[PDB]
Amino acid sequence: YCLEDALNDLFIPETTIETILKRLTIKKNIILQGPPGVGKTFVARRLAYLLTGEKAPQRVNMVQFHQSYSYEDFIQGYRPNGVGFRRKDGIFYNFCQQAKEQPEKKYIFIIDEINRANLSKVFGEVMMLMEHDKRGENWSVPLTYSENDEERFYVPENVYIIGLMNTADRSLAVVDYALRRRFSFIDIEPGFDTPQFRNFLLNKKAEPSFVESLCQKMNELNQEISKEATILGKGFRIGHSYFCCGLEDGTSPDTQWLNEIVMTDIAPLLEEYFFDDPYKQQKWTNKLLG
Amino acid sequence: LNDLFIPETTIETILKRLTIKKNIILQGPPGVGKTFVARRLAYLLTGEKAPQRVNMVQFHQSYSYEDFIQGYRPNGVGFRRKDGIFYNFCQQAKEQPEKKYIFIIDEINRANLSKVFGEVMMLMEHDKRGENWSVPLTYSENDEERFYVPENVYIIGLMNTADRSLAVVDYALRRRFSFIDIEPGFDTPQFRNFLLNKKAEPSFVESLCQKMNELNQEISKEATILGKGFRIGHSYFCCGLEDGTSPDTQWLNEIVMTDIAPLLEEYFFDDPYKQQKWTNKLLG
Amino acid sequence: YCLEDALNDLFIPETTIETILKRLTIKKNIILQGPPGVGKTFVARRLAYLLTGEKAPQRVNMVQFHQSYSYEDFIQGYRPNGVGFRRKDGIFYNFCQQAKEQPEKKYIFIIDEINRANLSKVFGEVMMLMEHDKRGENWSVPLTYSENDEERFYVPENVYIIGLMNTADRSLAVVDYALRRRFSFIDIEPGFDTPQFRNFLLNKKAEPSFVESLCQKMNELNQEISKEATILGKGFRIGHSYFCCGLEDGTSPDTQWLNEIVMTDIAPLLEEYFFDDPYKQQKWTNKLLG
Amino acid sequence: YCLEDALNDLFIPETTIETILKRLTIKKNIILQGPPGVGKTFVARRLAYLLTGEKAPQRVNMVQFHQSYSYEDFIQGYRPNGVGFRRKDGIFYNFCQQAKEQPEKKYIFIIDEINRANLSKVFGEVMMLMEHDKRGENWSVPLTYSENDEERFYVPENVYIIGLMNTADRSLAVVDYALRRRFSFIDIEPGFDTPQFRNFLLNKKAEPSFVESLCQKMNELNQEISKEATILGKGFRIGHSYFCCGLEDGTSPDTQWLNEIVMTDIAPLLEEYFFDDPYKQQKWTNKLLG
Amino acid sequence: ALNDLFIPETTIETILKRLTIKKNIILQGPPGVGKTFVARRLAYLLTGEKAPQRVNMVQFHQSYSYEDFIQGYRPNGVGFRRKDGIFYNFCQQAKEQPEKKYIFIIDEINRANLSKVFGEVMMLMEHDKRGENWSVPLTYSENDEERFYVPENVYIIGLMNTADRSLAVVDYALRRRFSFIDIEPGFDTPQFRNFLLNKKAEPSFVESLCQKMNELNQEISKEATILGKGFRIGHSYFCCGLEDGTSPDTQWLNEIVMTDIAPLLEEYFFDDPYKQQKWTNKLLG
Amino acid sequence: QPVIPVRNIYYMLTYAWGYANLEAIPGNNLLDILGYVLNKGVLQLSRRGLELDYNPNTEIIPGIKGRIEFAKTIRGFHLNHGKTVSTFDMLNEDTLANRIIKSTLAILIKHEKLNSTIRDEARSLYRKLPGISTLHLTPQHFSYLNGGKNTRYYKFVISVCKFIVNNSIPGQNKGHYRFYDFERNEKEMSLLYQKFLYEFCRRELTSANTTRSYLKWDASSISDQSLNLLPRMETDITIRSSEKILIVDAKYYKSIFSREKFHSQNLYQLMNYLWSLKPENGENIGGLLIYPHVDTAVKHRYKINGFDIGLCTVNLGQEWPCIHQELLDIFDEYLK
Numbered sequence A, C, D: 001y002c003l004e005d006a007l008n009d010l011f012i013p014e015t016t017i018e019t020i021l022k023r024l025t026i027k028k029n030i031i032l033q034g035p036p037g038v039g040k041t042f043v044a045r046r047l048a049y050l051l052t053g054e055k056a057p058q059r060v061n062m063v064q065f066h067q068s069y070s071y072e073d074f075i076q077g078y079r080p081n082g083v084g085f086r087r088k089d090g091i092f093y094n095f096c097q098q099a100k101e102q103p104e105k106k107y108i109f110i111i112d113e114i115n116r117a118n119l120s121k122v123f124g125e126v127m128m129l130m131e132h133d134k135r136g137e138n139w140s141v142p143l144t145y146s147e148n149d150e151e152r153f154y155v156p157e158n159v160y161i162i163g164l165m166n167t168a169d170r171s172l173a174v175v176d177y178a179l180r181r182r183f184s185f186i187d188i189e190p191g192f193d194t195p196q197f198r199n200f201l202l203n204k205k206a207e208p209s210f211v212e213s214l215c216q217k218m219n220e221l222n223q224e225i226s227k228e229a230t231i232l233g234k235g236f237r238i239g240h241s242y243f244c245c246g247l248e249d250g251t252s253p254d255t256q257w258l259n260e261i262v263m264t265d266i267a268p269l270l271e272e273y274f275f276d277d278p279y280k281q282q283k284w285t286n287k288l289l290g
Numbered sequence B: 001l002n003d004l005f006i007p008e009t010t011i012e013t014i015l016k017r018l019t020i021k022k023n024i025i026l027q028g029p030p031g032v033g034k035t036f037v038a039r040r041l042a043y044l045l046t047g048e049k050a051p052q053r054v055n056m057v058q059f060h061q062s063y064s065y066e067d068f069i070q071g072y073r074p075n076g077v078g079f080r081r082k083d084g085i086f087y088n089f090c091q092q093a094k095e096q097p098e099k100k101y102i103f104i105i106d107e108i109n110r111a112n113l114s115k116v117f118g119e120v121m122m123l124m125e126h127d128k129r130g131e132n133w134s135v136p137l138t139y140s141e142n143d144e145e146r147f148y149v150p151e152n153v154y155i156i157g158l159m160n161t162a163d164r165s166l167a168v169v170d171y172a173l174r175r176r177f178s179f180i181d182i183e184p185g186f187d188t189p190q191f192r193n194f195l196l197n198k199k200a201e202p203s204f205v206e207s208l209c210q211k212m213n214e215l216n217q218e219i220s221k222e223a224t225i226l227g228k229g230f231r232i233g234h235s236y237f238c239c240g241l242e243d244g245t246s247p248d249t250q251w252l253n254e255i256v257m258t259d260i261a262p263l264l265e266e267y268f269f270d271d272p273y274k275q276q277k278w279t280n281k282l283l284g
Numbered sequence E: 001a002l003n004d005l006f007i008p009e010t011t012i013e014t015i016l017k018r019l020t021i022k023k024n025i026i027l028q029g030p031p032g033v034g035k036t037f038v039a040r041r042l043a044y045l046l047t048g049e050k051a052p053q054r055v056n057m058v059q060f061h062q063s064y065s066y067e068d069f070i071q072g073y074r075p076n077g078v079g080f081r082r083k084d085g086i087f088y089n090f091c092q093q094a095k096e097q098p099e100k101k102y103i104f105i106i107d108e109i110n111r112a113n114l115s116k117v118f119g120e121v122m123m124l125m126e127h128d129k130r131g132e133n134w135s136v137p138l139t140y141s142e143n144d145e146e147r148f149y150v151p152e153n154v155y156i157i158g159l160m161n162t163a164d165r166s167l168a169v170v171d172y173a174l175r176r177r178f179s180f181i182d183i184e185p186g187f188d189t190p191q192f193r194n195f196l197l198n199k200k201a202e203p204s205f206v207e208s209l210c211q212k213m214n215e216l217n218q219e220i221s222k223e224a225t226i227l228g229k230g231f232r233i234g235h236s237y238f239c240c241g242l243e244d245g246t247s248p249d250t251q252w253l254n255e256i257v258m259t260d261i262a263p264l265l266e267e268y269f270f271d272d273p274y275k276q277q278k279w280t281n282k283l284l285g
Numbered sequence F: 001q002p003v004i005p006v007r008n009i010y011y012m013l014t015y016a017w018g019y020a021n022l023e024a025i026p027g028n029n030l031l032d033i034l035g036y037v038l039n040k041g042v043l044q045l046s047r048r049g050l051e052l053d054y055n056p057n058t059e060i061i062p063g064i065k066g067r068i069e070f071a072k073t074i075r076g077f078h079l080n081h082g083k084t085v086s087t088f089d090m091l092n093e094d095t096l097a098n099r100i101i102k103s104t105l106a107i108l109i110k111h112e113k114l115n116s117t118i119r120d121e122a123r124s125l126y127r128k129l130p131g132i133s134t135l136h137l138t139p140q141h142f143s144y145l146n147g148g149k150n151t152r153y154y155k156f157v158i159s160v161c162k163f164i165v166n167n168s169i170p171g172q173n174k175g176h177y178r179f180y181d182f183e184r185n186e187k188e189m190s191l192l193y194q195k196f197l198y199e200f201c202r203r204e205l206t207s208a209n210t211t212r213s214y215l216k217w218d219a220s221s222i223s224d225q226s227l228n229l230l231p232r233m234e235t236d237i238t239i240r241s242s243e244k245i246l247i248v249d250a251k252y253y254k255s256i257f258s259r260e261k262f263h264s265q266n267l268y269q270l271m272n273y274l275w276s277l278k279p280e281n282g283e284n285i286g287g288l289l290i291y292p293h294v295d296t297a298v299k300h301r302y303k304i305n306g307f308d309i310g311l312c313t314v315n316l317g318q319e320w321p322c323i324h325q326e327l328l329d330i331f332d333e334y335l336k
């Protein structure tokens, strides 16, 4: 694999990307926060093969957390083989052993929608271990269900951790500031006013006039969203994905095509963002069309 | 395509939206034939009247990830890992890639939709369907064993808009689902043609649309309290006249007291006069 | 091993360090409460070797409470054997037996993030027994899952217990005042003003102005953090761990490196901290940058 | 077992212990209700030997309740064999059977931290027998786990039951219904303004004025706490045992010794108490040092 | 039976009109209305054969669950077996006889969580989705050989009571699938008056009591919030004790006032003993 | 019998609680004002999403969920009927914080004297929270919530519920409620006045430092070092700046509202505060008495016993910004 393969279709600047791999090589734990539809899931699979430098998925593990996920599933816990219960090494525990076998090669674990599940309960023993300076056998710790003190778990140095959390819900946020310290938080923005986003459209037979009209409009609207941080923060602003997908057949992005999606997707979204203001819904919706 | 009371354009939107986007939320008041619409529509997309492909469920607050996808549950001997319907269903459709298999979820609003879907809340999107996007499940014994949505699967969500719960808003799921409103369709001829081909009076049908619209418009007057999502559906009128009793003013009078009157209480709670007013308005 | 060895790299004054051993030797159970990044985990392994007087791991045990530990995990519980259950002596019970193997040499048990777990549930009977006075065979008590034949578990005198409760998560704070009497609570400050921190930077190719400027700004901020108690109390004030690490390669400390820190780690924390006005966020970030 | 050994060291007035001894012979089900650090656990071990008149471990039993404690361990229940389940006599069943042998000799059962577990879950059916009037073989009952109705258990009159409960937690404001009918609550004072507590210090090379100066502030402080009812009741007030301990070396009490206790125990407790008014912490902390 | 029933025939006729079409129904009314006795006679009426075997009755409670109602695993002597519940067994009995109407009685339905109990089947009981077409395999049905479908013949009656002010708004699940019916106490009805005059009751004694209770029934429902129409007293207390062999009399009523209405009167208000005493004294004479 | 217009009082409460349009609402009385924000405030929260706290649940279920507790299962023999005692963390909105809001809404609806629209909209929201359990509110509940884990926004709206609960009186009916006539009592109004200023001063007077100072008597007594008998003295506020220190004593009196004799007994407290206080910097010492008046504002300065003292008033009922203007204008004079 090579770097440029990823960057061709990526709307985010490389400057952010260079910042990202710099931290990740250092910190080994990171959190990518933005609104939905900005390619967090998109970049993450790409990014792993960059960091390794080779497109090895076996060294990559990708999971989505949720409420029905626990330390028993993740790390270790007792589960039924059948008649007899057994100790079942969780998925992360298995992943760490694989990386130990090949210390040189970087092994990467990808957690989508991390902010949902109670990380405090899930990581637990890991919450201390995962930090960049505390990895290795010197800091080996026995687990809850370890048979004796000698059975101990230490994070390998090669491991890199990726955290993916949407900023739409203030309810689900990583308020545990101690947990915040382990992770290096890099915001990601919608990136409408980018060449690579525009080049993708023009490459798909798009009008440069329509494009400049488009990006300017959303940029103003997204900025309006960031303004009312008390009500709706910058994290709430619309992503670029709505416009991205749907042209695979070859349909040209005319003004009509945009007008169709706005009615179907963003319009009810706008209604929710402005529960109290119908005019503000009417204002921006009509603003787009003309 | 004959007995449907919803506009032909609206269904044409859906089929184009559905095939492309593969995920939708059909939101409207009760009595708009959400169940019948999708079931009628589902056979169109397959092109054949195949019920085995189609499976429907009605979510509820106690519904859980244990039920839908995977879960540890008891056999006669003891406990084992039991594949929920969707894992069972997706495998069945995965067996036959060519044909289009459908999954219908009623009363979706009740359950904590994030909780139920879990892993597939990411996977369900049309682009992230395939072995590349497979992931090991929560309860998967091994990291190598994974689950991926097949491309043939298409998903339909049916939503009652009259019970908003100010508990959880997810705008990310809204990215997955293309939301499509459904109006009752009293104005539509297809609703009228059904009744006039059931020996109704021409004025009686015309009188009803005036009566319902005045009520429905008032419901949508105060968007904050109620909305077009709250307004009354038509389906109550469909049922009960196929026995052989053609429409009459008495039959109307039954339904008002039978069905709508609690709704009024539900809607216009602690305001009997408005209920009595709007009730009596229809009877006159 | 001696204090000179431990306090070579530690940023803490000796003042607390002797105070720590003073309360410990009399009381035998203590807790260090401070925000994350102040070396709570860092001191703990060093402290253990002081009292024993030697760098020995065997006499020491380290664990973390993750809000899913239980009395069955800590002390005594039933575990599946191949077909049927058996009783397993927990780690602490396993640990105390080692400590009483030789009373002469001191044994230490180290618990990270102790505040998480419901300590009353886990320790149970031990909550009385841990205290210095009620130790030894005189206060032997029979355990819950002990055999009908009288078999009793008593804390050896040599044992010392250390707890590590972060001060960020308010909810996860000790309200078991009965338990808080067994322990002695030692506040730890961020460590900005200390020269031992400053020397660590200056020894690592740093300007005294840039160092002295840094401490001035942070101390201003923590006062503002300390100013409030409604949301952000004194305990929330920022630790020094962020600045400590990442310079091993030879990167000298400068505004470039500092700028990377502020944007990447602190700037997320601040907006998460305040979430009322960006101006306060824009203010203090620019202050550190400028 | 002379009272002089028992009562000389104690800080409590001889009146209340005598009053306690009265009801204990009378009702045999007693609860000591006071904040931690007033010797509730301390007295009860002595009190058992007072009644018997001898230092006998066999006739006196001590336990601490917690959530894991249950009927099946307390009274009777089934313990797994390698596969099979074997019934096992619990503590109280085994304990009373000893008391059945010697009806004349008084037998004592001490339960610390009783509120933590529900009595009904543990005691259950036996709460009928436990009451003072309905004791003896006349009221015998067959057990839940008794193989046959023939096997029966009755609480002999000789056993006395002691419960140590701390009024330091918010949940205990709603005291359990099971306790109130069957137990007689008695309040233990903090016992600062007592001769023996003072005389304890005076024997330990203490200035009277420094001793007398301290008590008024402690007496003053606890009065302030008791005035509140919403957050901190009278039961939360400070106990007298922080000061007792730590003089085993012979080091004389002084502001130096006292200041250690204030900063390392009482200062953060006050932060927990007076979270709402941090300045109120400053008011007292400065007051005590002066 | 209609003459034995005290409620308006119009409501009796109206209900059979609704249930036959709707197939799901719930009766909400005061305690002491003979709601259970009402449904049974109605159940026998609709079938036309006075068959108890077709009839099965259940009383819900908060613990009541899917294992009790539908299916669950119960311990064997060794190991455990899948154990058919009531509704699973009941419908399969009805499945053999499609023509034959089969009825199910759920008492105190509002206490339990319908969803937790029914689960999957909670949609299948909706009249629109009935028969083999809507068959679904059960949670514990390990194989797909058999799926559970309620056949058309089934009718479900739910007995709910408007007695309790503690009760909040009914669960949304119920409202959807069920038609809510209010049952009158039936004091005013002649059929109840002919149920006392047939016992040689005085017309003055009969008519006075009707007016007497009506005076109360208005006052109890006069309260806007706390005590509504549903609270008002039913007639069932009056039935038991007259046709056993003892004739009606004011002294017989006087005992009844103290027995049921007097504590009930205390229970509803629970504030003013005089207001209770005034009403209790008013009832007696 | 004049009191301040009710709308402006809400601004004082906001500063008192340490954190909107009231022009729209037509209800002069307070409860219309307070409920509208609460009714609207919850709607603001729900847009973002209400707080969900992981609540552990340990129960008897037909399968493995989360962590099975081996002990409770074997003791209860739940294996035989295919059941386990297992612990898992269901995520609900039924926490104390959310429960307080919902039960309060019942109180708000039950209030006898209230705008019709406010009562109607709240009843909607009460239905809109089906999962939450109603509760009987006490300060003890609010007392437990001093942790304040919730957001800054939650803590503001919660404080509102505290005002309502304590200032709710049953009226004509046993069920319904009636609002307290808060304005009439001076004492809480004074405590409002003092608390309003202290948090206000931190906001606007960033230039100066604002702290409450406890004071100690200069006295020595042979009898007791404690001096418990002596009155406890704690400043209402002290506002210290490099150029000048300044202590303020402010109280809410009904007599002063009348434009005659003057009620200034609080001055007696003030002088002794000046005496017991000794400044290390020794730049200067100044005092201020500030009171609420209805009609107009009057300012005087005095030089009494070597101290520079101000008496001043504020024309409450004028306008909140001009009042906000006036207060900052006031301190500029004396802070010099």
Ligand SMILES: Nc1nc2c(ncn2[C@@H]2O[C@H](COP(=O)(O)OP(=O)(O)NP(=O)(O)O)[C@@H](O)[C@H]2O)c(=O)[nH]1
Pocket: A009, A010, A011, A012, A034, A035, A036, A037, A038, A039, A040, A041, A042, A043, A165, A166, A240, A241, A244, A245, B122, B127, B172, B175
């Ligand atoms: N072709 C292309 N698609 C992109 C690019 N960036 C984002 N997308 C598209 O946007 C969609 C969502 O990607 P995703 O990472 O899941 O966004 P997200 O922020 O993770 N969303 P969420 O947080 O809700 O899961 C996909 O269609 C993805 O391919 C891009 O640079 N090129």
Ligand SMILES: Nc1nc2c(ncn2[C@@H]2O[C@H](COP(=O)(O)OP(=O)(O)NP(=O)(O)O)[C@@H](O)[C@H]2O)c(=O)[nH]1
Pocket: A128, A133, A178, A181, C009, C010, C011, C012, C034, C035, C036, C037, C038, C039, C040, C041, C042, C043, C166, C240, C241, C242, C244, C245
């Ligand atoms: N070299 C050196 N590093 C220090 C010192 N103090 C803290 N650190 C560093 O700061 C980082 C974290 O320290 P740590 O003990 O884990 O803080 P903590 O309070 O235990 N963390 P938490 O509260 O989150 O559990 C490590 O790099 C640690 O070595 C110090 O005095 N010297």
Ligand SMILES: Nc1nc2c(ncn2[C@@H]2O[C@H](COP(=O)(O)OP(=O)(O)NP(=O)(O)O)[C@@H](O)[C@H]2O)c(=O)[nH]1
Pocket: C133, C177, C178, C179, C181, D009, D010, D011, D012, D034, D035, D036, D037, D038, D039, D040, D041, D042, D043, D112, D164, D165, D166, D200, D240, D241, D244, D245
């Ligand atoms: N010399 C002396 N020591 C006392 C006296 N009262 C308490 N102490 C000491 O206080 C320490 C703890 O006493 P303890 O009984 O455990 O308090 P408690 O009520 O049991 N604590 P908790 O409520 O938390 O369980 C012991 O050192 C005990 O001897 C006393 O009157 N005289």
Ligand SMILES: Nc1nc2c(ncn2[C@@H]2O[C@H](COP(=O)(O)OP(=O)(O)O)[C@@H](O)[C@H]2O)c(=O)[nH]1
Pocket: B003, B004, B005, B006, B029, B030, B031, B032, B033, B034, B035, B036, B037, B194, B233, B235, B236, B238, B239, E128
């Ligand atoms: N002919 C015809 N029947 C309809 C139409 N809409 C609904 N129905 C019938 O109304 C009955 C109930 O529909 P249902 O799905 O339960 O209502 P909903 O789920 O609330 O939308 C079924 O017989 C439907 O087929 C329609 O548009 N045309």
Ligand SMILES: Nc1nc2c(ncn2[C@@H]2O[C@H](COP(=O)(O)OP(=O)(O)O)[C@@H](O)[C@H]2O)c(=O)[nH]1
Pocket: E004, E005, E006, E007, E031, E032, E033, E034, E035, E036, E037, E038, E235, E236, E237, E239, E240
């Ligand atoms: N004969 C006759 N008895 C009735 C009638 N209504 C109620 N009852 C009697 O009242 C009793 C049942 O009352 P019910 O309310 O169901 O008792 P509950 O279930 O405990 O509330 C039985 O004696 C019924 O026969 C009726 O209309 N005719």
Ligand SMILES: [Mg+2]
Pocket: A037, A039, A040, A041, A042, B122
């Ligand atoms: Mg994504």
Ligand SMILES: [Mg+2]
Pocket: A128, C037, C040, C041, C042
């Ligand atoms: Mg640490």
Ligand SMILES: [Mg+2]
Pocket: C128, D040, D041, D112, D164
């Ligand atoms: Mg104790």
